[PDB]
Design a protein around this ligand. Structure first.
Ligand SMILES: [Mg+2]
Lengths: 99, 79, 1337
RNA sequence: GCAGAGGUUCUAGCUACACCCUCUAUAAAAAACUAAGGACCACACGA
DNA sequence: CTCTGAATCTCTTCCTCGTGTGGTCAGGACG
DNA sequence: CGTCCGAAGAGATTCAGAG
């Protein structure tokens, strides 16, 4: 039994920090994302992708809103996506976000 | 409490437009001081929003009309 | 906020622009002082301060001080969050070619330079000198010059020209060439070239050059002089490690590169001899390319622990890559994991949830409610309250849990139903309870199985879960219309126990007022549960339009069935419950309830039926016991008889009468026959042997034995397992697959011999390893299916296209595997079908087929119904709702915007675990016979002989449905004429498989043309007949002088005049191929319809489906006629046989190359229709798409994949295969450019060319012609508009390299792309968001 | 309560996700209170 | 003599989530 | 105290028969 609301994040800022005896969260892997995609579900998938896992501003704002009692979501960008962008940049390949 | 949302799904056919309209209604309930028209009996905001959709008293068109009217009183308040 | 991303090759100027500084010291931080080094890899001056708004100097410690650099230390003061974005670079002393563009198989660096990859590797490794700006030299401008020959050139040429070495030489070459000049030069070379291979290579090169000129890319940008570094925060490993702070990490590779670069500067200022300098430059290039991609080159650098240390490319690609680890599937918060528990008391939508688990999961909600209540003034006080776990916390937890759905998710999420929401119910314990019915849908046992529990947060999320994710919302599995919450083990057994009749039982033969009285009699115990009693039932009918009418009647039934009746809703009839209610019967009952009463009554009935099944199964006490199993009395006698038979066969082998192989085959066959006999005896001892009186002397009834109840009801196991328990187990295969000679005589009930157990465990271990490989390959196939999928959503409500695929019941020569009704169910008709009464509109054009409508179609017994297909739908980037048909998730046409692609991919992938890893024609029943594509000539006896090769017998009953279809090989003779009713069980057609007939179309005499005995045809005598028969020599076997001559048969009269084909000006010549034996003599009249010469003549596993979806060409494909025409042999067995097909009107457009060893069904004189088989063999899907059309290839692939699925008894609706097929052939190739801007050589998505040609049709210019080509799922997903989805799939380095070279701009718009970006998915609710965004754009 | 400091406690507490009051250059009548940082590889096991 | 179809040589992963155990550049002395 | 050293298949790339 390993239920956790919020735990210490990794350097990739993915909050669960691996499934461990130490407090952390379970992985929502690729097949789970496929399952939500097959469902007519998009908002909950967006939460699992951004506000629950790797959006620092998103996570802080979500926690403040929930303790305020109003459940509002701010998408932002996953920190893992910025990690991917920086890693591809390190390869010498210019990847940029169009405005 | 609603075990199933079928009555809503024939109220709103797409069943994804259902999520959007009832989510806006529940948002109005939580953020605004406005309360659901159908009486609340130990029900969360989303459940009572689905209940209002079930009676047909709330739909996307009615919700848009209501918010437009509210903006109308907002403009009339400034005069 | 931000549009779709773009990717391009990064310029050195752009790299410098990104970098906040330049690093020159390899060591990152001091171990003595934790502060980062001034110029180390970990730098605050370059990458920002280690602490949020604290400087290294410590002079600045406040927010107001932020933005002011400290001159003493030299760093900027900001938040450490900036350190993640801030980036640095290294200025290499000499340029180094980027490994991705170098070592990749396309060899972009080599392709641009037009130089072989080996030469490029040599010049980069300084082994050879390449020529740059040769000018006035005998050497060409681009030439590879080895060390000794470079020295010879240097001593020979005193001119200023020199051949540079290393990466800088390649950079100079890249600068030297002009892309535009090379562009027109290569275009004119393409115009000049007459070879397909050379023009294809030059086309690849010109594609590279066109991508370079079109995008903002420079050739010299491939070789990077400045090397960017990862930010110190985005650096892996580097843990405190109890202050050891030591781990292998990309930091090691960066330190290697920086050390090399520093040493290179040290020797450049030192001006070292050129040999040491070039060796060190090669070392630096090795360090750099190892950093970029470790293991890309032959030598792979290893770090500590003797392992290949992680590199930048390795962090991107593979399972461990950032894509699949942290972008596609992200570890999430508010997730709880625990073992599963049954908890039968729960309803369908409710699941058990431990108190502590809900506490931990819902902590923010609890804190918010505590603050609202005013119990805790501060969030810290709320956390303290939760830690105290005081009483008020529990009541608060009750409020939030009450109406807040949570997602229950089994770890392997094979299909869509893997994750389903539930309304949690707080329980005392530590284990999650899952409702028993849905556990079958979850494919979850109760054996330490664990399910993740995720908590939706936003109101959109909770509402989304309640509307869609909740279990009660999705009763029907997406794969097939059959319900997925069907009773599985206990409840089905209890229902079977209730719905059974015992000939004598307590309370038999009394009449009962109603179900209430039946329940009262059973619970009182005076009347037995199962006993035939007349009862009065108030049956309700749905025939009234939106109204229920009560029918009261006395229906003979058992007490158990009458009790069960009160449970079912009113609308359902009594016929469904009157039967024994096996598992299939209960599934049909639930399906009828769903179709008639609706979703909510179906859910209530399912919960009530589960409760009743559990209760009455507990009352039954259907226990398994040793005495319950019965060994057949005939089993020992059967074993003795089989022993006698095998002994006789052994004695025959000893005497030598029978060979070893035939002996083994006979032993296996007789053992199998004995196994079937003992199985029948065992089954009879189970059900038939049960005898109990009917108030008379004796009565025989169906068994109440527990084992037979479990098997017959379908609760658990099958007949074969019951045979294994009590009957003889049967032959067990050896690991090689060969059947063991001696089967396992003893059953599982009796003692089992040691050797018998060893033989059994062979198959057991084989099955376990097969299961492991099955789940591995099934996961891979599911991933490929999803990734080729997920680019399909229902954008448009109605496509409005008349064209659609024809649907007919599938036939393999036996009983129809799938009736037409099941196939056409849920599919909108392409065209208005017609009643058997002519010119009657039985069904309108665009109407959806519901249950009553399909039943009406069965009544009229239609055979073929044209059906809208997703492939036929012409919508761009989307699939029509009407074209798709019913979603199968719920009883209506699919809702607009829903993601069909992922649904179908999961539906196909899910059964993969269940999928295993590895003459004459007799009519089954009497009916009309039909022949299609038939050319028939009657013989002397009058029996019909076919001239057409592809004639198909169709058995059509009085209703008109084609019950049976049989393939008829060419030259076969059928006694029964066409259109004549054939009695069942009699052979209509007979033929010889070994003999390939050569019939004569018209009776007449023959003249031998170009026939010489002993040269072209060798006369061979037959002793039995007494008449020597001319034998045509095989072309390759016979001599070259006889090879070129072609024997020809000409029909003539008695006078000798040649006879033409009746109705054809062309003569009736006949050609005799090699290895043909002609019994008839020259100058002998030949009857019509008689053969002239007697010419001597897959896997059902998951890999078959994988190959089909990947469209792998078979090892030996079948040659298909490209165009309709007559066949001529240009060259006979000249290396390979050459075939020419030419129409009578059009010139010969095709020459066909055929291997000599292949059998040819074609005859040269006979005309061949386009798409007809030339050489019999496995059918290649690409050939079908090229020739027979897209509808034909879709039909073939769907039929064959479904037939693979049919073998294992798993059904997937055809639309799921159809959408994947549509994705497979989404690419297209342009035959002629026409008015379109697209070049004919280039290949573009069919959507783009469709939009372009319809836009051209809008104007005067005609649309460009296009050719549709089939791509494998891996290939189709690998090559698509968006590079991000391809990179997440496979060959990530290849995909990113191709994107950067081409500079391709992603358009996003896909599910996987939006998942990776993290923005709202255009799959479910987000489709309206995306259409609003499109309106905004 | 948004830039800082002080206050009755307990070195320090200016919303740092964070808990009370004051003002724009000056320190106390006052009770509930406080901490936000850390990887990979191997083995075995469950599904 | 210049490509043909073929045989050979090279990339590229080859399920998917748990729960426990352990092992991981290592600079080293010298101005 | 800080500082420098199997297996399966796809694709490219040779490869080689045949006028
Ligand atoms: Mg299990």
């Amino acid at each position: 039994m390993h239920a956790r609301s919020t735990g210490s994040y990794s350097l990739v800022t993915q909050q669960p920090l691996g499934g461990k005896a130490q407090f952390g969260g379970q992985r929502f892997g690729e097949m789970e994302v496929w399952a939500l995609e097959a469902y007519g579900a998009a908002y909950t998938l967006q939460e699992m992708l951004t506000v629950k896992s790797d959006d620092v501003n998103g996570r802080t704002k979500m926690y403040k809103n929930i303790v305020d009692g109003n459940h509002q979501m701010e998408p932002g960008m996953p920190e893992s996506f910025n990690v991917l962008l920086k890693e591809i940049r390190s390869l010498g390949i210019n990847i940029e976000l169009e405005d | 409490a609603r075990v199933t949302v079928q009555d809503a799904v024939e109220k709103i056919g797409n069943r994804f437009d259902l999520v959007l309209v009832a989510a806006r209604r529940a948002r109005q309930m939580q953020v605004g001081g406005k309360d659901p028209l159908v009486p609340e009996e130990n029900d969360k905001t989303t459940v009572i929003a689905l209940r209002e959709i079930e009676e047909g008293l709330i739909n996307n068109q009615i919700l848009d009309v209501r918010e437009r009217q509210e903006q109308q009183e907002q403009e009339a308040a400034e005069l | 906020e931000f549009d779709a991303i773009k990717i391009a090759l990064a310029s050195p100027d752009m790299i410098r622009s990104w970098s906040f500084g330049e690093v020159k010291k390899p060591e990152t931080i001091n171990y003595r002082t934790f502060k980062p080094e001034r110029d180390g890899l970990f730098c605050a001056r370059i990458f920002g301060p280690v602490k949020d708004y604290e400087c290294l100097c410590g002079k600045y410690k406040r927010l107001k001080h932020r933005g002011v650099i400290c001159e003493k230390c030299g760093v900027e003061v900001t938040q450490t969050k900036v350190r993640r974005e801030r980036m640095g670079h290294i200025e290499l002393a000499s340029p180094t070619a980027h490994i991705w563009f170098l070592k990749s198989l396309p060899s972009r660096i080599g392709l641009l330079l037009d130089m072989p990859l080996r030469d490029i590797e040599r010049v980069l490794y300084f082994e050879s000198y390449v020529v740059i700006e040769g000018g006035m030299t005998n050497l060409e401008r681009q030439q590879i010059l080895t060390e000794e020959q470079y020295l010879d050139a240097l001593e020979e040429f005193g001119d200023e020209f020199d051949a540079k070495m290393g990466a800088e030489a390649i950079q100079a070459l890249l600068k030297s060439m002009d892309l535009e000049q090379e562009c027109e030069q290569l275009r004119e070379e393409l115009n000049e070239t007459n070879s397909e291979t050379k023009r294809k290579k030059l086309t690849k090169r010109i594609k590279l050059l066109e991508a370079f000129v079109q995008s903002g890319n420079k050739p010299e940008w491939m070789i990077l002089t400045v090397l960017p570094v990862l930010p110190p925060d985005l650096r892996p490993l580097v843990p405190l490690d109890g202050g050891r702070f030591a781990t292998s990490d990309l930091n090691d590779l960066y330190r290697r590169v920086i050390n090399r670069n520093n040493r290179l500067k040290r020797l450049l200022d030192l001006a070292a001899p050129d040999i040491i300098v070039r060796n060190e430059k090669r070392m630096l290039q090795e360090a750099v390319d190892a950093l970029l991609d470790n293991g890309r080159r032959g030598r792979a650098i290893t770090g500590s622990n003797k392992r290949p240390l992680k590199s930048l490319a390795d962090m991107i690609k593979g399972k461990q890559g950032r894509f699949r680890q942290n972008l596609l599937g992200k570890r999430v918060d508010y997730s709880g994991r625990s073992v599963i528990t049954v908890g039968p008391y729960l309803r369908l939508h409710q699941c058990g949830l431990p108190k502590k688990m809900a506490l931990e999961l819902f902590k923010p909600f609890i804190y918010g409610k505590l603050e609202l209540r005013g119990l805790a003034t501060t969030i810290k006080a709320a956390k303290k309250m939760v830690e105290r776990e005081e009483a008020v916390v529990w009541d608060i937890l009750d409020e939030v849990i009450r109406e807040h759905p949570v997602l229950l998710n089994r770890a392997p999420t094979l299909h869509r139903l893997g994750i389903q929401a539930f309304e949690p119910v707080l329980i005392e314990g530590k284990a999650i309870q899952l409702h028993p019915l849905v556990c079958a849908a979850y494919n979850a046992d109760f054996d330490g199985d664990q399910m993740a529990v995720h908590v939706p947060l936003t109101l959109e999320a909770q509402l989304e879960a309640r509307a869609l994710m909740m279990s009660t919302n999705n009763i029907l599995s997406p794969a097939n219309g059959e319900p997925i919450i069907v009773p599985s083990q206990d409840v089905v057994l209890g229902l079977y126990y209730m719905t059974r009749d015992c000939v004598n039982a307590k309370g038999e033969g009394m009449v009962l007022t109603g179900p209430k009285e039946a329940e009262r009699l059973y619970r009182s115990g005076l009347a037995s549960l199962h006993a035939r009693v007349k009862v009065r039932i108030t049956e309700y009918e749905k025939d009234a339009n939106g109204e229920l009418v009560a029918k009261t009647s006395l229906k003979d039934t058992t007490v158990g069935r009458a009790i069960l009746w009160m449970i079912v809703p009113k609308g359902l009839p009594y016929s469904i419950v009157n039967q024994a209610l096996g598992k299939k019967a209960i599934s049909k009952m639930l399906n009828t309830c769903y179709r008639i009463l609706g979703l909510k009554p179906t859910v209530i009935f399912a919960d009530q039926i589960m409760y009743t099944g559990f209760a009455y199964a507990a009352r039954s006490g259907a226990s398994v016991g040793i005495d319950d199993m019965v060994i057949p009395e005939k089993k020992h006698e059967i074993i003795s008889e089989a022993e006698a038979e095998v002994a006789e066969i052994q004695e025959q082998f000893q005497s030598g009468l029978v060979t070893a192989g035939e002996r083994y085959n006979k032993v296996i066959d007789i053992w199998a026959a004995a196994n079937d006999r003992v199985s029948k005896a065992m089954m009879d001892n189970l059900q038939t042997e049960t005898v109990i009186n009917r108030d008379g002397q004796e009565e025989k009834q169906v068994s109440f034995n527990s084992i037979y109840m479990m098997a017959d009801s379908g609760a658990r196991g099958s007949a074969a397992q019951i045979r294994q328990l009590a009957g003889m187990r049967g032959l067990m295969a050896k690991p090689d697959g060969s059947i063991i000679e001696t089967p396992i005589t003893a059953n599982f009930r009796e003692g089992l011999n040691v050797l018998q157990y060893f033989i059994s465990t062979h198959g057991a271990r084989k099955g376990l390893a097969d299961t492991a490989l099955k789940t591995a390959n099934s996961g891979y196939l599911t991933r490929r299916l999803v990734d080729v999928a997920q680019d399909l959503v229902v954008t448009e409500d109605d496509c409005g296209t008349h064209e659609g695929i024809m649907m007919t019941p599938v036939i393999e020569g036996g009983d129809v595997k799938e009736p037409l009704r099941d196939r056409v169910l849920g599919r909108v008709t392409a065209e208005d079908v017609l009643k058997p009464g002519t010119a009657d509109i039985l069904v309108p054009r665009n109407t959806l087929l519901h249950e009553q409508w399909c039943d009406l179609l069965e009544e009229n017994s239609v055979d073929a119904v044209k059906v809208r297909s997703v492939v036929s739908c012409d919508t761009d980037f989307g699939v029509c709702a009407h074209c798709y048909g019913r979603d199968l998730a719920r009883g209506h046409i699919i809702n607009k915007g829903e993601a069909i692609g992922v649904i179908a991919a999961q539906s196909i992938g899910e059964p993969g675990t269940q999928l295993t890893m590895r003459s004459s024609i007799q009519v089954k029943n009497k009916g009309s016979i039909k022949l299609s594509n038939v050319k028939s000539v009657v013989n002397s006896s009058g029996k019909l002989v076919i001239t057409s090769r592809n004639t198909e017998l169709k058995l059509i009953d009085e209703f008109g449905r084609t019950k049976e279809s049989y393939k008829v090989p060419y030259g076969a003779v059928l006694a029964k004429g066409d259109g004549e009713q054939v009695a069942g069980g009699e052979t209509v057609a007979n033929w010889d498989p070994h003999t390939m007939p050569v019939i004569t179309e018209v009776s007449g005499f023959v003249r031998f043309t170009d026939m010489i005995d002993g040269q072209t045809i060798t006369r061979q005598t037959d002793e039995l007949t007494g008449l020597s028969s001319l034998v045509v020599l095989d072309s390759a076997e016979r001599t070259a002088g006889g090879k070129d001559l072609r024997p020809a048969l000409k029909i003539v009269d008695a006078q000798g005049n040649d006879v033409l084909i009746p109705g054809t000006d062309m003569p009736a010549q006949y050609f005799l191929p090699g290895k043909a034996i002609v019994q008839l003599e020259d100058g002998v009249q030949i009857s019509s319809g008689d053969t002239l010469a007697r010419i001597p003549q897959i896997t059902g596993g998951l890999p078959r489906v994988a190959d089909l979806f990947e469209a792998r060409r078979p090892k030996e494909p079948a040659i298909l006629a490209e165009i309709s025409g007559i066949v001529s042999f240009g060259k006979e067995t000249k290396g390979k046989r050459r075939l020419v097909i030419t129409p009578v009107d059009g010139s010969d457009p095709y020459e066909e190359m055929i291997p000599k060893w292949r059998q040819l069904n074609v005859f040269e004189g006979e005309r061949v229709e386009r798409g007809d088989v030339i050489s019999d063999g496995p059918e290649a899907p690409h050939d079908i798409l090229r020739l027979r059309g897209v509808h034909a290839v879709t039909r073939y692939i769907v039929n064959e994949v479904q037939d693979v699925y049919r073998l294992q008894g798993v059904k997937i609706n055809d639309k799921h295969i159809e959408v994947i097929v549509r994705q497979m052939l989404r690419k297209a190739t342009i035959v002629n450019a026409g008015s379109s801007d697209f070049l004919e050589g280039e290949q573009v998505e069919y959507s783009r060319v469709k939009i372009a040609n319809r836009e051209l049709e809008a104007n005067g210019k005609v649309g460009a012609t296009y050719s549709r080509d089939l791509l494998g799922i891996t290939k189709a997903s690998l090559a698509t508009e968006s590079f991000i989805s391809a990179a997440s799939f496979q060959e990530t380095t290849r995909v990113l390299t191709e994107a950067a070279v081409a500079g391709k701009r992603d358009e996003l718009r896909g599910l996987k792309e939006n998942v990776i970006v993290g923005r709202l998915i255009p799959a479910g609710t987000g489709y309206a968001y995306h259409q609003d965004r499109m309106r905004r754009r």
